[PDB]
Design an enzyme around this catalytic site. Structure first.
Site, mmCIF file in Angstrom:
data_model
loop_
_atom_site.group_PDB
_atom_site.id
_atom_site.type_symbol
_atom_site.label_atom_id
_atom_site.label_comp_id
_atom_site.label_asym_id
_atom_site.label_seq_id
_atom_site.Cartn_x
_atom_site.Cartn_y
_atom_site.Cartn_z
ATOM 1 N N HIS A 12 0.760 -1.249 0.000
ATOM 2 C CA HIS A 12 0.000 0.000 0.000
ATOM 3 C C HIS A 12 0.787 1.293 0.000
ATOM 4 O O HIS A 12 0.146 2.319 -0.093
ATOM 5 C CB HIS A 12 -0.944 0.031 1.250
ATOM 6 C CG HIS A 12 -1.932 -1.079 1.272
ATOM 7 N ND1 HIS A 12 -2.886 -1.247 0.285
ATOM 8 C CD2 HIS A 12 -2.103 -2.099 2.145
ATOM 9 C CE1 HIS A 12 -3.613 -2.309 0.570
ATOM 10 N NE2 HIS A 12 -3.166 -2.830 1.692
ATOM 11 N N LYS A 41 -5.116 -10.159 -7.187
ATOM 12 C CA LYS A 41 -5.763 -9.494 -6.064
ATOM 13 C C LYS A 41 -6.849 -8.577 -6.657
ATOM 14 O O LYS A 41 -6.535 -7.744 -7.486
ATOM 15 C CB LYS A 41 -4.723 -8.706 -5.226
ATOM 16 C CG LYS A 41 -5.365 -8.016 -4.059
ATOM 17 C CD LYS A 41 -4.395 -7.490 -3.021
ATOM 18 C CE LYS A 41 -5.215 -6.940 -1.862
ATOM 19 N NZ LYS A 41 -4.440 -6.336 -0.757
ATOM 20 N N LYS A 66 -14.520 -2.120 8.759
ATOM 21 C CA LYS A 66 -15.569 -2.821 8.009
ATOM 22 C C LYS A 66 -15.941 -4.180 8.608
ATOM 23 O O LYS A 66 -17.098 -4.611 8.563
ATOM 24 C CB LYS A 66 -15.097 -2.960 6.566
ATOM 25 C CG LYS A 66 -15.299 -1.669 5.802
ATOM 26 C CD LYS A 66 -14.682 -1.786 4.407
ATOM 27 C CE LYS A 66 -15.065 -0.610 3.512
ATOM 28 N NZ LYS A 66 -14.466 -0.718 2.150
ATOM 29 N N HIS A 119 -3.445 -2.847 7.867
ATOM 30 C CA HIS A 119 -4.413 -3.049 6.790
ATOM 31 C C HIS A 119 -4.922 -1.743 6.228
ATOM 32 O O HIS A 119 -4.999 -0.742 6.968
ATOM 33 C CB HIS A 119 -5.605 -3.897 7.222
ATOM 34 C CG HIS A 119 -5.221 -5.223 7.790
ATOM 35 N ND1 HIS A 119 -4.602 -6.182 7.011
ATOM 36 C CD2 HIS A 119 -5.400 -5.786 9.010
ATOM 37 C CE1 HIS A 119 -4.385 -7.268 7.737
ATOM 38 N NE2 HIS A 119 -4.841 -7.050 8.958
ATOM 39 N N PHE A 120 -5.259 -1.735 4.939
ATOM 40 C CA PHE A 120 -5.929 -0.592 4.310
ATOM 41 C C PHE A 120 -7.430 -0.902 4.270
ATOM 42 O O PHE A 120 -7.870 -1.805 3.550
ATOM 43 C CB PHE A 120 -5.421 -0.327 2.905
ATOM 44 C CG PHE A 120 -5.958 0.986 2.346
ATOM 45 C CD1 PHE A 120 -7.202 1.027 1.727
ATOM 46 C CD2 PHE A 120 -5.267 2.176 2.544
ATOM 47 C CE1 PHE A 120 -7.709 2.218 1.199
ATOM 48 C CE2 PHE A 120 -5.785 3.375 2.067
ATOM 49 C CZ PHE A 120 -7.037 3.386 1.431
ATOM 50 N N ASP A 121 -8.232 -0.230 5.093
ATOM 51 C CA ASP A 121 -9.632 -0.569 5.168
ATOM 52 C C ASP A 121 -10.507 0.080 4.088
ATOM 53 O O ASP A 121 -11.396 -0.583 3.535
ATOM 54 C CB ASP A 121 -10.225 -0.206 6.539
ATOM 55 C CG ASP A 121 -11.338 -1.124 6.924
ATOM 56 O OD1 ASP A 121 -11.172 -2.344 6.703
ATOM 57 O OD2 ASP A 121 -12.352 -0.646 7.469
#
Ligand SMILES: CSC(=S)/C=C(\O)c1cccc(O)c1
Ligand SMILES: [Ru+3]
Length: 124
Positions: A12, A41, A66, A119-121
């Protein structure tokens, strides 16, 4: 051996450009960051800000993730990002993506000591 924090940086972080250098950006970047390894992905976001600025989001606006966990954080300022989304005609091993540049607030999940993004939400 790849820490979760390191994987986040691999998946990311792209501090090297201010914005998506080209309609090609996603095809090249998903590939070189090893995100077309075993499968395409489907969706992935790259952030074009400094590592320090993105790590600092873990001390910004606490919001629900999420998945319902509580360890997500929304940036106060907008950030330069690129969204990569697999095309309808994309077929592994020839993974193909539409590239979309934007400026939006990011939402990241943070974990660990030190407390860093893992994490990239979402973007909003
Ligand atoms: C879709 S959320 C929206 S666009 C929110 C903001 O820009 C924002 C939120 C809190 C503090 C702040 O200073 C800015
Ligand atoms: Ru805003």
């Amino acid at each position: 051996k790849e820490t979760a924090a390191a994987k986040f940086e691999r998946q990311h972080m792209d501090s090297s450009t201010s914005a998506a250098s080209s309609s090609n950006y996603c095809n090249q970047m998903m590939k070189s960051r090893n995100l077309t390894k075993d499968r395409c992905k489907p969706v992935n976001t790259f952030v074009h800000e400094s590592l320090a600025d993105v790590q600092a989001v873990c001390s910004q606006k606490n919001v629900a993730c999420k998945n319902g966990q509580t360890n997500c954080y929304q940036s106060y300022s907008t950030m330069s990002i690129t969204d990569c989304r697999e095309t309808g005609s994309s077929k592994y091993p020839n993974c193909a993506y539409k590239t979309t540049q934007a400026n939006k607030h990011i939402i990241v999940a943070c974990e660990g000591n030190p407390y860093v993004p893992v994490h990239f939400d979402a973007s909003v």
